[PDB]
Amino acid sequence: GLSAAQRQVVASTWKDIAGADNGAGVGKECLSKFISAHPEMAAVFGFSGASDPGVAELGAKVLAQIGVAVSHLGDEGKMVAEMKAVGVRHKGYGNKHIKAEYFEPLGASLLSAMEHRIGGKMNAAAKDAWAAAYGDISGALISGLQS
Numbered sequence: 001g002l003s004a005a006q007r008q009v010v011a012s013t014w015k016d017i018a019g020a021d022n023g024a025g026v027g028k029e030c031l032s033k034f035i036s037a038h039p040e041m042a043a044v045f046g047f048s049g050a051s052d053p054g055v056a057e058l059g060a061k062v063l064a065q066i067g068v069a070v071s072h073l074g075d076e077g078k079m080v081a082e083m084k085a086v087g088v089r090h091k092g093y094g095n096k097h098i099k100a101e102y103f104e105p106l107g108a109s110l111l112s113a114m115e116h117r118i119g120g121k122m123n124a125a126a127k128d129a130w131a132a133a134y135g136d137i138s139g140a141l142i143s144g145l146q147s
């Protein structure tokens with residue numbers, strides 16, 4: 001779970017991460033940099049590479065879903081139940097062999113993309129709160145995936 005102070009930091013900085021595009025730009029950079037750094041991951045997603053137009057499209061949907069998860073952090077069972085449902089759908093996505101291990105490096109590129117957009121606001125406490133928030137959001141998707 002998250003402490004009240006962590007949910008408050010996540011909720012507050014999400015407003016700047018969302019910007020004017022509901023975080024779409026952050027999603028594009030996240031997935032872009034992740035596949036560039038890990039080339040064998042293009043095949044796990046159904047993409048040709050980091051430049052595939054599907055990267056920008058999926059990047060927007062990933063970040064729009066985190067915005068929904070952020071609006072529900074105060075009710076943990078609610079947030080977990082909807083991320084599990086996202087997770088059950090992932091059984092049939094990409095190469096259909098999405099693994100739990102892949103979410104840990106993806107989380108690192110997500111925090112990097114966020115910091116790229118909001119700069120100094122993504123301080124030490126913001127990074128810890130978001131590493132914790134990403135741990136629970138992705139943790140709940142993985143449990144849907146392995147259900």
Ligand code: HEM
Nearest residue numbers: 044045046061062065066086089093094098102103106138
């Ligand atoms: C490295 C792990 C991941 C892989 C390989 C992956 C792969 C995919 C693929 C291939 C699709 C597109 C399916 C299609 O419509 O053709 C998809 C959709 C989606 N992914 Fe993931 N994904 C990953 C992580 C995440 C994370 C961390 C989130 C969390 C917010 C997420 C949220 C979504 C959402 C919201 C969709 C749109 C469709 C739906 O709601 O099920 N994905 N993902």
